[PDB]
Amino acid sequence: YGFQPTNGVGYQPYRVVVLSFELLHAPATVCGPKKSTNLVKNKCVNFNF
Amino acid sequence: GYFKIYSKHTPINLVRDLPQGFSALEPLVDLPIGINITRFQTLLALH
Ligand SMILES: *[C@@H]1O[C@H](CO)[C@@H](O[C@@H]2O[C@H](CO)[C@@H](O)[C@H](O)[C@H]2NC(C)=O)[C@H](O)[C@H]1NC(C)=O
C-alpha cells in the first residue's frame, strides 16, 4: 500500500470487519440480550417468563 | 442432535456386589453437537 500521513480519503487505511450470520443450519447458540422488567405482586398481569 | 448425559454417584449399600435397588438420575451436560456416533470405547490406566 502507498499511504502517507494525511494523504486524503481514498488512501487512508480503514478497519473493515465482515460478519456473516448462520441461521437454521444448527441449533441456535448466539442470541441478543432481551430487555427485562420488574415483576408485580397481587395484580392481574399477563406474564412471559 | 442433542447429546445429554445423566449421572448418579451416591451408592446404596443394600446388598453386596450386586446393584439391587433403584434411584432417579438428573441431567448434567447437554451439548448441541448434532452428529450421530455409532461406536465408542473407554479409556483406562495400566501399570
Ligand atoms: C447421521 O445420520 C444421518 C442419516 O442417518 C446422516 O445424514 C446425512 O448427512 C449428510 C452430510 O454429509 C447429508 O449430505 C445427507 O443428506 C444426510 N442424509 C440424511 C438422510 O439425513 C448424517 O451424516 C449422520 N451423521 C451426523 C449427523 O453426524
Curated annotation (Swiss-Prot), chain A:
Instruction: Give the recorded effect for residue 7 to Y.
Output: Increased binding affinity to human ACE2
| UniProt effect for mutating residue 7 to Y | In strain: Alpha/B.1.1.7, Beta/B.1.351, Gamma/P.1, Theta/P.3, Mu/B.1.621, 19B/501Y, Omicron/BA.1, Omicron/BA.2, Omicron/BA.2.12.1, Omicron/BA.2.75, Omicron/BA.4, Omicron/BA.5, Omicron/BQ.1.1, Omicron/XBB.1.5, Omicron/EG.5.1; May enhance affinity to human ACE2 receptor
Annotated region described as Disordered, given as residue ranges: 25-47
Changing residue 4 to R: reported impact? In strain: Omicron/BA.1, Omicron/BA.2, Omicron/BA.2.12.1, Omicron/BA.2.75, Omicron/BA.4, Omicron/BA.5, Omicron/BQ.1.1, Omicron/XBB.1.5, Omicron/EG.5.1
Instruction: Report the protein's function.
Output: Attaches the virion to the cell membrane by interacting with host receptor, initiating the infection. The major receptor is host ACE2. When S2/S2' has been cleaved, binding to the receptor triggers direct fusion at the cell membrane. When S2/S2' has not been cleaved, binding to the receptor results in internalization of the virus by endocytosis using host TFRC and GRM2 and leading to fusion of the virion membrane with the host endosomal membrane. Alternatively, may use NRP1/NRP2 and integrin as entry receptors.
- Complexes and interactors: Binds to host ACE2. RBD also interacts with the N-linked glycan on 'Asn-90' of ACE2. Cleavage of S generates a polybasic C-terminal sequence on S1 that binds to host Neuropilin-1 (NRP1) and Neuropilin-2 (NRP2) receptors. Interacts with host integrin alpha-5/beta-1 (ITGA5:ITGB1) and with ACE2 in complex with integrin alpha-5/beta-1 (ITGA5:ITGB1). May interact via cytoplasmic c-terminus with M protein. May interact (via N-terminus) with host bilirubin and biliverdin, thereby preventing antibody binding to the SARS-CoV-2 spike NTD via an allosteric mechanism.
Listed name of the protein: Spike protein S1
Q: Which organism is it from?
A: Severe acute respiratory syndrome coronavirus 2
Q: Shown portion of the whole protein?
A: 495 to 543 of 1273
